[PDB]
Design a protein around this ligand. Sequence first.
Ligand SMILES: C[C@H]1O[C@H](O[C@H]2[C@H](O)[C@@H](O)[C@@H](O[C@H]3[C@H](O)[C@@H](O)[C@H](O)O[C@@H]3CO)O[C@@H]2CO)[C@H](O)[C@@H](O)[C@@H]1N[C@H]1C=C(CO)[C@@H](O)[C@H](O)[C@H]1O
Ligand SMILES: [Ca+2]
Ligand SMILES: [Cl-]
Length: 448
Amino acid sequence: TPTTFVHLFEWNWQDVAQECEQYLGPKGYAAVQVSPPNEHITGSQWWTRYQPVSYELQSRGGNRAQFIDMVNRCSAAGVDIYVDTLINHMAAGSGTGTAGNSFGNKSFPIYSPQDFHESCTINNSDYGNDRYRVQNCELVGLADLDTASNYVQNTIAAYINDLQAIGVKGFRFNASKHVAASDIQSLMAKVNGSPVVFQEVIDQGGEAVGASEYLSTGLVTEFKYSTELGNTFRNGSLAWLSNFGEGWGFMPSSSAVVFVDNHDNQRGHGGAGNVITFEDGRLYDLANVFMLAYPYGYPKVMSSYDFHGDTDAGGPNVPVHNNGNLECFASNWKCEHRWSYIAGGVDFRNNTADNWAVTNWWDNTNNQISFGRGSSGHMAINKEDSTLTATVQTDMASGQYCNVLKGELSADAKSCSGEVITVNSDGTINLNIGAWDAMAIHKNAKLN
Ligand SMILES: C[C@H]1O[C@H](O[C@H]2[C@H](O)[C@@H](O)[C@@H](O[C@H]3[C@H](O)[C@@H](O)[C@H](O)O[C@@H]3CO)O[C@@H]2CO)[C@H](O)[C@@H](O)[C@@H]1N[C@H]1C=C(CO)[C@@H](O)[C@H](O)[C@H]1O
Ligand SMILES: [Ca+2]
Ligand SMILES: [Cl-]
């Protein structure tokens, strides 16, 4: 069962199409979030994608034909496409777009100055006490669309419906806290069918606008998850995670989209240094293992590029699939979705989807934890400086299983490529996990 999606940040359409066929489909990823495919301002910075000029599908990722090719190929491989949709604003200032269209003074190919709110600036203090300014003023000078206007709603809905017609299955509504939830309710009434929609709402608490206001229009990004997980893995105790989720004050599990990090917070935009990213190596593997094994929310794995400290920089000048070479793991594309522990965690989640409970939780009161998903699977993380050798109880059938974080079961089910884990006749496992390592086993990776 598909349970996890991935964000292939700044990947062009040809690269995404091949990745769906060679990796994502076979490994079981449910979908892919792509960078904004609509016309945007020229420039090499990654953020140019968030300044639209029109809704024509001509962007840094490729042209319309290439985009369509990608949706078809991915769809054939069993992988959905989620489009990052800009519903709050248009580009700032004046210039030219990726399809040749020029714009200026709040005048675009599809919008006139009267289709925007009167200009004003959102100040940092407005988030805590002025809901009106947060939703009607400009975010960093971006022209603010009059989202209450029937013309504007019809225009955005037509783009969304056009994308569904092509075959797109879902949408990420970017900068949603800056649009009144009621404006989104009206917009959705114009959208055909019921696609998967997740709204980017950054709410850490104490804001004039809350994430709970968006629960009725689709899923919502739970940013507290990313910050609390990072804070616990770096400065707290893993034993504290025994009741992670609604117990910590997060939104309902069935409404939340979660992640260890995202494209914004891994570079400072809306997230502090406690956020864990690819730069943290093994800490990142372990954080992902917990997230994928834990039954809270709909997770999305991050897929980045080494930005070399430059937070405005765009991606590598070389494709991922470069003439038979995979430009992964080095100083170009990081390809975290291909990392053994992460891919292994996705497999665990997919195979324990018939039991969403946390059973037999165990911890050493600090950084050693273990828990199961009933008879469907069991896992353990060791973040202490010495070997975890405790005997833990599971609800699994006795036998030998592959630690899917380090390998996989052969086609004939007679061998594993990584270490074997034994479940004794009484259901117990005598653990043997080194410092900063983990293990996960499930009922569909049992040796014959
Ligand atoms: C016009 C504006 O362009 C750039 O701003 C970027 C952000 O740096 C980038 O993070 C991204 O913003 C997203 C944000 O991270 C996310 O939380 C939110 O939900 O969605 C945002 C995208 O919609 O994209 C924007 C837009 O490209 C520059 O970094 C900014 O400096 C720049 N502001 C300029 C321009 C003007 C007016 O001409 C001044 O008012 C402004 O002070 C100046 O700095
Ligand atoms: Ca707005
Ligand atoms: Cl997000």
